[model samples]
Target: SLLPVPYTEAASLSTGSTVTIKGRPLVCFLNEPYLQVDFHTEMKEESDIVFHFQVCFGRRVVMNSREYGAWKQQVESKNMPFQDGQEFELSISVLPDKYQVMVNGQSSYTFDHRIKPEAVKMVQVWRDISLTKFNVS
Candidate 1:
């Protein structure tokens, strides 16, 4: 089954926590588009350049560079160059100092902890982010 991404990292989850997120999508804003997670400290490191995303998933969350504004790409996923209607699985693992992000069982990005691991506070699920389930084991 599918589940929405949690607003907070479970307390039991720690460095090395691995979880898979499943969902139905096509980057088209079948849901509203926006950046769900971003560098909490620097929310302005993004560009309208369509940095990187699978349109089929129908969502994007990035930080701006200069103004550091965190914004969502309005472009629909399916309309994007490589968007394909399919289930997306994002796996996340907590490292001593960072959180690793893997998309569709693929390594998508790894980011240093912008906020303290304990202060990470939340793992947000935004519109268009129709997550089915988040399995952490």
Candidate 2:
């Protein structure tokens, strides 16, 4: 019971920065609920994205970027660390060369920089989930 869905926040990231999120799916895993977190170049939702992270619950996770309004190369992962009908803690850390993702204290995914983290001015978290906490450090 905190932030609303489709949450948007002004954000800035650099090397060693970390974005943390706490949330739970709005539906069961079998229903294929989705979660998306986008790091954009501007505060607007349509702004070019420096990083796009999406998950099709119980299915897959995809990562990419949108530059000049076009999506770039996509990275997909089949590793699913989230538990069914449970809340989750997600952490994304920015590094010199890539972003490291940890799910519930376990390293889960990494996406090499397609656009430098400095280009991100906004962060949006949306889709089939209830967000409880979000922090940038």
Candidate 3:
């Protein structure tokens, strides 16, 4: 099934799964737009996020974790490959030790595993950008 905008849906992700997001940024944020894929401790209530992949426009892409109610220092990528108002395809590939990310079919960044991948059940999106499609395997 496809997940649409203004919603977070259930996802099944494992070592061989890949999540694809096709979308474009919103009008502003000066390219400060962002997209995140999160693994939460609980579904309904706000809870700890096991893994957070964020694209901070004009800055860097970051991989982070929040445990025991605190966020740790972010792990960032060396490149910025996103553009405003441009259609893009982003993918997160699950690996044995990390999540390999690619933007517009180009290798973007990788986030090392911080928690059990099997624990991930939700995909989160933000208002900073517009998402045309979200698919999980």
Which candidate ranks first by TM-score, i.e. highest? 2
Q: State every prediction's TM-score relative to the real structure.
A: 0.53, 0.98, 0.86
Off by over 4 Å in 2: none
Q: lDDT-based ranking, best first?
A: 2, 3, 1
Runs with alpha carbons beyond 4 Å of true place in candidate 3: 1-4, 28-31
Clashes of 3: 0
Better of 1 and 2 by lDDT: 2
- Full-model lDDT, candidate 3: 0.75
Clashes of 1: 27
User: Where does candidate 1 have its weakest 10-residue lDDT segment?
Assistant: 47-56
How many clashing residue pairs, candidate 2? 0
Off by over 4 Å in 1: 1-13, 26-82
lDDT of 2 by residue, 13-95 (tens): 99999999999999999999999999999999999999899999999999999989888899999999999999999999999
lDDT (0 to 1) per candidate: 0.44, 0.95, 0.75
Kindly report which residue pairs in candidate 2 clash with one another.
Answer: none
Which of 1 and 2 is ahead in TM-score?
Answer: 2
Ranking by TM-score: 2, 3, 1
Q: TM-score for model 2?
A: 0.98
Task: Give the per-residue lDDT of model 3 (tens digit) for 1-137.
Answer: 33455557776678998988887776554747766667666664366776787776767777898877789878977598886668779888999999888888888888788887887767676656677787787
